């Protein structure tokens, strides 16, 4: 009915291998060269990746800064507000990054700041300034 379990006999491959006198060994040699070609390509990219891994030796451990967390405070200080304004200038609408810089202000408090002091800190101008870069 159909080829035995694991026997491969497509209409296409039959015509291709029968096409001429030595079409058989042509197709088989073509894949043998194809095979050794990919094998040497592996050996190479394995060596390239071996070299690149050696450049990453040590990781990023000397450059890891210790974790500093303080309680997420409610009160805005003059000092903190100014940090915020600068963070808006640098990061834009990245409420997360801005929150991380200030330290003790939640992502919502930052969003509140954006609308509370919207007039007084010209946050409109500040945001369009960031988009210029």
């Amino acid at each position: 009915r159909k080829p035995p379990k694991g026997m491969f006999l497509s209409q296409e491959d039959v015509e291709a291998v029968s096409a001429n006198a030595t079409a058989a060994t042509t197709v088989l040699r073509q894949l043998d060269m194809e095979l050794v070609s990919v094998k040497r390509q592996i050996q190479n990219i394995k060596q390239t990746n071996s070299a690149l891994k050696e450049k990453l030796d040590g990781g990023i451990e000397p450059y890891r800064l210790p974790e500093v967390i303080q309680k997420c405070n409610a009160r805005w200080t003059t000092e903190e507000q100014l940090l915020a304004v600068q963070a808006i200038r640098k990061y834009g609408r990245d409420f997360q990054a801005i929150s991380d810089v200030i330290g003790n202000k939640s992502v919502v408090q930052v969003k509140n700041f954006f609308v509370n002091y919207r007039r007084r800190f010209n946050i409109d101008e500040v945001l369009q300034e960031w988009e210029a870069e």
Partner: protein, 670 residues
């Protein structure tokens, strides 16, 4: 099957349906009411049953009606018509049986049968039992032809036919019951022995043995799919052979092995390049982190009190460094998960090769074995038709004749006019009758003329193929006959008989294979036979090897035989053989080969063409269409059972019926 249906089966007939044969003789019944057909069928089956239950004595019409019940014994003309039909066509009262009604006082008609092979002898017995004058002309000094049996003392080995291929529906089952006939079963266990350098040959482990054989079967079944479903039957205006197709199948399996490997290594590289691109990003990110750490460190060293912009710089660079260290850990996690997938892929490669040198050698033994069965290289067998007779194979385990297969023809030859040492040179057939011209084989100048009504030609196909002809036909055989002779394949296989003074092999093992070194010589002494308490080993030469081995002296052959035997049973425990016999069937002028095969470009239809009788032209021009004169029996003339003893036996029975119908008339249509 069992009962009256068992009898129909044993006679190669459907129990519940009328055959084309029967439709011809009983057209009234088969075109008529369904009821009467079932009546017919029972009568037919019951008569067969009766015959088969006791084939040692003749079954008469009276004795048949005797054992019939109502309403089957009501219509006695139908019972007679059936009995006579079954009698004519040799379905009842064939072989060697005690006659109830002694032979007719005078004979009607005269028939010359060429060759006293089994087909000849079978027909001769029948024609004689139908009250005809029969004389067989045999070139050899013995009956049986391709049923040859070497004898010495009590030790016996068949150089010709040897295996009875199952008793279920085999006409030989009847013959064996009719005679002494001691049949011995064949233990199908066959260990294979491959070379091991200077060391003794190692038995192939059940691991490989079973996997290669199953691959062999799978390869055959694959060629069958390739033939039927894909129609790969003609290639460059030439018919595709089995070996031709097997190559294509094997090649496509190697292609697959390579295709699987390519896409596996290509699955590696695409990940090996994912790793490459990730490692590059990681190196660059480490560079920006290194630079950003310095920038932070510098900004952080501007000691308080700082103004808010200097304060922002510290906090800003700090946040940014944590964000880039966040990114590096994502990429470091991916790196490990890619390296883990890279080992996964490299731990599970696909199949290394399709077949190793060791495998392909064992597979070639299985091919050689198939070349032995079909008595021909697989490059000669028709892809589409080589196996057309597979459905008609008998049931039951295969057996051998203990006292030597020639037992059978000799027993069939009893009470027949057989002229031995008489080689037919020319067959003349005309409207008025026939004359057969033969010479004495011993002195070929001594000539013999035989005048007869009909000639039955049982000459082997190989003989019929000879160029220039060994037998001449006057007038020549028509194009349609000669073309069939041409197209049909007539193969070859040979046997070597090895007589030793002592049994040095495993006495409980019936047969063991030897694995050859190359494809070229896969058939060369590829298998060894052992049976009785007799110390004979029987070496088999098959495929392309058979033909070439015939051009090699007995000594060299016996040499190669011992070499292989030493290589298995120890280079010392193998004595010199006392008696050796080497068959050469292709060289034998009364055979010119071993038996037929379905050649590429032939088909089962050519076998029918072979059986077709010849009707000569009219003597006086304008005279009516004459009787058929020249008739053909033999292994090569029976579509459903070619290349066998039973097939020959049946072909003989067939012709005897056709000749009787033609020259004695059909008494059952009266």
């Amino acid at each position: 099957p069992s009962g009256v249906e068992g009898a129909a089966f044993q006679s190669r007939l459907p129990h519940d349906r009328m055959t084309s044969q029967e439709a011809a003789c009983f057209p009234d019944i088969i075109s008529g009411p369904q009821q009467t057909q079932k009546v017919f069928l029972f009568i037919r089956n019951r008569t067969l049953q009766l015959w088969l239950d006791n084939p040692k004595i003749q079954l008469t019409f009276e004795a048949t009606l005797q054992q019939l019940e109502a309403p089957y014994n009501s219509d006695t003309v139908l019972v007679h018509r059936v009995h006579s039909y079954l009698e004519r066509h040799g379905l009842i009262n064939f072989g060697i049986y005690k006659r109830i009604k002694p032979l007719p006082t005078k004979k009607t008609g005269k028939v010359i049968i060429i060759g006293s092979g089994v087909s000849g002898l079978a027909a001769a017995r029948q024609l004689q039992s139908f009250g005809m004058d029969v004389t067989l002309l045999e070139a050899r000094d013995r009956v049986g032809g391709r049923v040859a049996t070497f004898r010495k003392g009590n030790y016996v080995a068949d150089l010709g036919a040897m295996v009875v291929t199952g008793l279920g529906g085999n006409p030989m089952a009847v013959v064996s019951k009719q005679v002494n006939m001691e049949l011995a079963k064949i233990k199908q266990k066959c260990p294979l022995y491959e070379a091991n350098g200077q060391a003794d040959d190692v038995k192939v482990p059940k691991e490989k043995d079973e996997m290669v054989e199953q691959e062999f079967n799978r390869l055959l079944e694959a060629t069958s799919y390739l033939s039927h479903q894909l129609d790969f039957n003609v290639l460059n205006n030439k018919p595709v052979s089995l070996g031709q197709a097997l190559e294509v199948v094997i090649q496509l399996q190697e292609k697959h092995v390579k295709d699987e490997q390519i896409e596996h290594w290509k699955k590696i590289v695409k990940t090996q390049e994912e790793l490459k691109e990730l490692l590059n990003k990681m190196v660059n990110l480490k560079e920006k982190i290194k630079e950003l750490h310095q920038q932070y460190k510098e900004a952080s060293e501007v000691k308080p009190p700082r103004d808010i912009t200097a304060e922002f710089l510290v906090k800003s660079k700090h946040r940014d460094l944590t964000a880039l260290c966040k990114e590096y850990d994502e990429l470091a996690e991916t790196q490990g998960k890619l390296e883990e997938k890279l080992q996964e892929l490299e731990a599970n490669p696909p199949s290394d090769v399709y077949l190793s040198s060791r495998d392909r050698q064992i597979l070639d033994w299985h091919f050689a074995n198939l070349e032995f069965a079909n008595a021909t290289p697989l490059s000669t067998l028709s892809l589409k038709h080589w196996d057309q007779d597979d459905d008609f194979e008998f049931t039951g385990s295969h057996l051998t004749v203990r006292n030597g297969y020639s037992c059978v023809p000799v027993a069939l030859a009893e009470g027949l006019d057989i002229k031995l040492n008489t080689a037919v040179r020319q067959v003349r057939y005309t409207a008025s009758g026939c004359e057969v011209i033969a010479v004495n084989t011993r002195s070929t100048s001594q000539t013999f003329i035989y005048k007869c009504d009909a000639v039955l030609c049982t000459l082997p196909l190989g003989v019929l193929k000879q160029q220039p002809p060994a037998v001449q036909f006057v007038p020549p055989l028509p194009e349609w006959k000669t073309s069939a002779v041409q197209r049909m394949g007539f193969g070859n296989l040979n046997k070597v008989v090895l007589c030793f003074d002592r049994v040095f092999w495993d006495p409980s093992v019936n047969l063991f294979g030897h694995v050859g070194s190359t494809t070229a010589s896969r058939g060369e002494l590829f298998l060894f036979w052992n049976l009785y308490k007799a110390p004979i080993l029987l070496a088999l030469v098959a495929g392309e090897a058979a033909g070439i081995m015939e051009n090699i002296s007995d000594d060299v052959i016996v040499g190669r035989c011992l070499a292989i035997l030493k290589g298995i049973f120890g280079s010392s425990a193998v004595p010199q053989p006392k008696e050796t016999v080497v068959s050469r069937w292709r060289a034998d002028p009364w055979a010119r080969g071993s038996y037929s095969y379905v050649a590429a470009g032939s088909s089962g239809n050519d076998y029918d063409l072979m059986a077709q009788p010849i009707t000569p032209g009219p003597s006086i021009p304008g005279a009516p269409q004459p009787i058929p004169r020249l008739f053909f029996a033999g292994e090569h003339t029976i579509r459903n059972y070619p290349a066998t003893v039973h097939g020959a036996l049946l072909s003989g029975l067939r012709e005897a019926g056709r000749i009787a119908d033609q020259f004695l008339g059909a008494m059952y249509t009266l």
